[PDB]
Symmetry: C4
Subunit: 88 residues, 4 copies
């Protein structure tokens, strides 16, 4: 699907931005930065929190911007891929 493709690409770019930011500013390992971005944007959350004020401000903006996109991608993956394969 085309819109699923654009949602996938935007989700990947968002997770890449989060990885880069949290590895630079918060000094996380790249895998830890990626995990934090993922559990944050899916609203799972973890015991980790940003320590710098820049990290906290960016996390607020990142949450507000990326929750909608990550969950649009999850919803489209569920409704246009997972449902037909289940029907099979």
């Amino acid at each position: 699907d085309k819109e699923f493709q654009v949602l996938f690409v935007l989700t990947i770019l968002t997770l890449i931005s989060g990885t880069i930011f949290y590895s630079t500013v918060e000094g996380l390992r790249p895998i830890d930065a990626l995990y934090f971005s993922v559990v944050t944007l899916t609203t799972v959350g973890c015991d980790i929190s940003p320590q710098t004020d820049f990290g906290k401000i960016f996390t607020i903006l990142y949450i507000f911007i990326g929750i909608g996109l990550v969950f649009g991608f999850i919803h489209k993956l569920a409704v246009n891929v997972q449902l037909p394969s289940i029907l099979s």
Copy 2:
């Protein structure tokens, strides 16, 4: 859009109320109070929990009143604003 503007203003006022409350009652720094309000209303959560009973009661009420508004704002941002990707 107008409804988007109402939702933005209400979200800002809700986060301001949360910031003021958690900086007064829970003694958090204002940036920390804002971060806690944001991660609470978006259901992300963090390792911080209110220590006073007043903080806990206010958080229960704050969750129930503000989750709907915050996620309405996120949805309207993602749909009525976050679609310039249609310029694909």
Copy 3:
């Protein structure tokens, strides 16, 4: 509203059940048990986790049963109360 009334009553009974359970089995203070039930059923989550296996099993069942009801109540409070008052 009638269905809003039944959703409110069911949410109150669910939070009461959670308060009683987590104050007895997990030894929490009643306010702490109520706060844990609230942040759990709204998927906010907190740093607290049940220590007993009974608490963990009950929490799994409680999550699955009460997320749908708590969020039906939140959705109805947003759509049948908050929206018209906003329009005013």
Copy 4:
């Protein structure tokens, strides 16, 4: 219902996969592995985070694949089963 049964079976299989994985890779007790899978897929979250990189990668993928199915099961339970309250 039949779709409810498919969703229940898929949810059980997903939680079983999560239990097995988190008990092997992360060394959790089986009850703890099941609890972590449940609170992760429902987006509640807990103070536990995977310690191995394999655990983190698997959790990212597990979140993205299972959130849709788990919440479809919760919705179908709450709507097609949790309405005997209509006997009001």
